[PDB]
Amino acid sequence: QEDVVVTLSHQGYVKYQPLSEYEAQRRGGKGKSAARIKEEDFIDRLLVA
DNA sequence: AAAAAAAAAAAAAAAAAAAAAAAAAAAAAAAAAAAAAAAAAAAAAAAAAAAAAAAAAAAAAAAAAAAAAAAAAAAAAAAAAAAAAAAAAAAAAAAAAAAAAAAAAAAAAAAAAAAAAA
């Protein structure tokens, strides 16, 4: 269907795409949700919603 | 001269393949539109350049949203067990150039035969 989905591409080999509803609201001041996106000595570049 | 293996007799067991004819689909190989890409012309918006200017960082200082401290409480993520996906390492292989052995054409010359001359 059309459902809001996240996508991100990193340096090297990443085109991972999780669903948007897994992450919940937070108050600005805490952050650090620690998403689970394994990366071996590369750098993230892009996120899209 | 001893050993061993093929082949053939006849009732039994058990298999395999080539084509025709029409109509539909599925691979697989081509011309041919159609658009990127590239070479070589003229052409034209941007940087340069200069003078002239006035809009936002400094500075004084209050005060009001703040980030550390304290506390309680919820429970995301990390590391350890197992269980699947997916890719290099190494080894193997079927056609394929190289070599060697047998079939068909070749004439030189003669044995045997057929035929005829005087």
UniProtKB/Swiss-Prot annotation:
<protein>
    <recommendedName>
        <fullName>DNA gyrase subunit A</fullName>
    </recommendedName>
</protein>
<comment type="similarity">
    <text>Belongs to the type II topoisomerase GyrA/ParC subunit family.</text>
</comment>
<comment type="function">
    <text>Negative supercoiling favors strand separation, and DNA replication, transcription, recombination and repair, all of which involve strand separation. Type II topoisomerases break and join 2 DNA strands simultaneously in an ATP-dependent manner.</text>
</comment>
<comment type="function">
    <text>A type II topoisomerase that negatively supercoils closed circular double-stranded (ds) DNA in an ATP-dependent manner to maintain chromosomes in an underwound state. This makes better substrates for topoisomerase IV (ParC and ParE) which is the main enzyme that unlinks newly replicated chromosomes in E.coli. Gyrase catalyzes the interconversion of other topological isomers of dsDNA rings, including catenanes. Relaxes negatively supercoiled DNA in an ATP-independent manner.</text>
</comment>
<comment type="subunit">
    <text>Heterotetramer, composed of two GyrA and two GyrB chains. In the heterotetramer, GyrA contains the active site tyrosine that forms a transient covalent intermediate with the DNA, while GyrB binds cofactors and catalyzes ATP hydrolysis. Can form a 2:2 complex with toxin CcdB in which GyrA is inactive; rejuvenation of GyrA(2)CcdB(2) is effected by CcdA.</text>
</comment>
<feature type="short sequence motif" description="GyrA-box">
    <location>
        <begin position="25"/>
        <end position="31"/>
    </location>
</feature>
